[PDB]
């Protein structure tokens, strides 16, 4: 059907594909979201020192 | 099982014709070379056949084909994406518009007609004249 490089190239693409679909590519560490579940932890760390 | 006749002799071609819509008309013969199979030879024009269907002497009218190539069809991913073959399109409606007309007499002509023409679209939607594809040849 098709040549070597073609199927090198459409496997690369399922890989990137597939690395999104994991639904974890929003996660930033330093978002507000994540601040408003982590604001206790941290303070009861500077209170615990 | 007698074999097919195999006669041989000089001939003359006839005058050619300009009929307005086609050209040609100098084959002699009734029939073909490589079919075994007679030939159509009266031509009509577009005004003819658009009369022949509003007053009822036109029953059938058929068109010719074409195939269509597989890297134009929408149906499924391309073919160089790798994926199985997909069967084969559709054919076309011939591009040339060669047509065949069928009247109720028996009678039998040709003509050029897009397919798509305003005219003749809305008469044939209209009148209700049997409208076909010829399929294709092997």
Known sequence: SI??????????IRLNWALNKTNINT???????????????????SKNN | PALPARATAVVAPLPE?????????????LYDNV???????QVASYGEVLEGIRTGRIS????????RAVTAS????????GGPQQPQPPPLASPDGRCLVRF???QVKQAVIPP??????????????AVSYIPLEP
Request: a positive charge.
């Open chain 2, 60 to 67: 059938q009218v058929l068109w010719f084909q074409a195939p």
């Open chain 2, 104 to 106: 109720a007499n028996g």
């Open chain 2, 116 to 129: 798509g023409e305003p005219r003749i679209s809305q008469a044939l939607q209209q009148y209700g004249t």
């Open chain 1, 3 to 12: 040549p070597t490089a073609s199927k090198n190239q459409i496997a690369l």
């Open chain 1, 27 to 45: 996660f930033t560490d330093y978002s507000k979201r994540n601040n408003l579940w982590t604001t206790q932890k941290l303070r009861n760390q």
């Open chain 2, 17 to 29: 014709k300009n009929y307005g819509s086609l050209r040609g008309g100098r084959w002699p013969f």
């Open chain 2, 74 to 81: 929408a149906a499924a991913p391309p073919p160089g994406l």
């Open chain 2, 35 to 41: 079919y075994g199979l007679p030939v159509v030879r």
